[PDB]
Design a protein around this ligand. Structure first.
Ligand SMILES: *[C@@H]1O[C@H](CO)[C@@H](O[C@@H]2O[C@H](CO)[C@@H](O)[C@H](O)[C@H]2NC(C)=O)[C@H](O)[C@H]1NC(C)=O
Ligand SMILES: Cn1cnc2nc(N)[nH]c(=O)c21
Length: 246
């Protein structure tokens, strides 16, 4: 299991937690030097448990699917909360079984559905470590509308940071001050799948992408990624969703 305590957290400890998270994910092979995530895994070994502690010491345990890094649900004291979707439901059979009651949230865990339930797109929700602290706080006591917002912050300050060096860096800059995400961040978040597929399709194609991937950069200018020599591939992305899942 991996743990992170917001109390006494600085950019450095966060970096270590995200490194720990990355190393918690299994993989047998690397593609162009980046860990390729497993196609599938059997039983309880498919889920990673994250223990998160807010500033006051309260905690929630989050269950993450190790083949994609998707959050499936979490535990607050004695109530387990799971997304309203098949995979999440499958996940309820191996984790948080000793919970007194299990609640199914009224939405599945994809950005589109979470942004609807939250009432705002993630362009306008501030993220950072202070926000993570709030997120944890908000999940300790049920409120489907509040949880949507908190989960959008949680998914990004953990899963998305794990997948992209850039996003981990964005969060370290927001260690004592929240700030809405840059469009580069949103763009990356949205391309993890495409990039993952294209970096794999370049393996028997001299490192050249079958189809170019379009992102928005630091400045907000539209850019095209056609090949693995790009910074995004050489230095940004840290995990690859196996094509068997796309
Ligand atoms: C692969 O991507 C690189 C960019 O990392 C392309 O780079 C060209 O050369 C410089 C720096 O590498 C770029 O800024 C230029 O805009 C590019 N000029 C060209 C040749 O178009 C490189 O071209 C790409 N190579 C491919 C497509 O195999
Ligand atoms: C980032 N992301 C995209 N679809 C997702 N679906 C679930 N269930 N959890 C996630 O963290 C997620």
């Amino acid at each position: 299991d991996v743990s992170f305590r917001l109390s006494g957290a600085d950019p450095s400890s966060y970096g270590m937690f995200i490194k720990d998270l990355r190393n918690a994910l299994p993989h047998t092979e690397k593609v162009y030097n980046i860990p390729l995530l497993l196609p599938s895994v059997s039983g309880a070994g498919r889920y990673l448990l994250m223990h998160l502690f807010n500033y006051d010491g309260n905690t929630i345990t989050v269950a993450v699917d190790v083949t994609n890094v998707y959050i499936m649900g979490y535990l607050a004291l004695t109530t387990s909360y799971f997304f309203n979707e098949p995979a999440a439901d499958l996940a309820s059979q191996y984790v948080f079984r000793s919970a007194r009651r299990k609640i199914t949230l009224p939405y599945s865990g994809n950005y589109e559905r979470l942004q609807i339930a939250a009432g705002k797109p993630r362009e306008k929700i501030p993220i950072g470590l202070p926000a993570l602290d709030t997120a944890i706080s908000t999940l300790l006591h049920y409120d489907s509308t509040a949880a949507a917002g908190a989960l959008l912050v949680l998914i990004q300050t953990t899963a998305e940071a794990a997948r992209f060096k850039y996003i981990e860096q964005q969060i370290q800059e927001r260690a004592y001050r929240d700030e809405v995400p840059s469009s580069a961040t949103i763009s990356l978040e949205n391309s993890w799948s495409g990039l993952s597929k294209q970096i794999q399709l370049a393996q028997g194609n001299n490192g050249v992408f079958r189809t170019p991937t379009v992102l928005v950069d630091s400045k907000g200018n539209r850019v095209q990624i056609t090949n693995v020599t790009s910074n995004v591939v050489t230095s940004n992305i840290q995990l690859l969703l196996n094509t068997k899942n796309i």
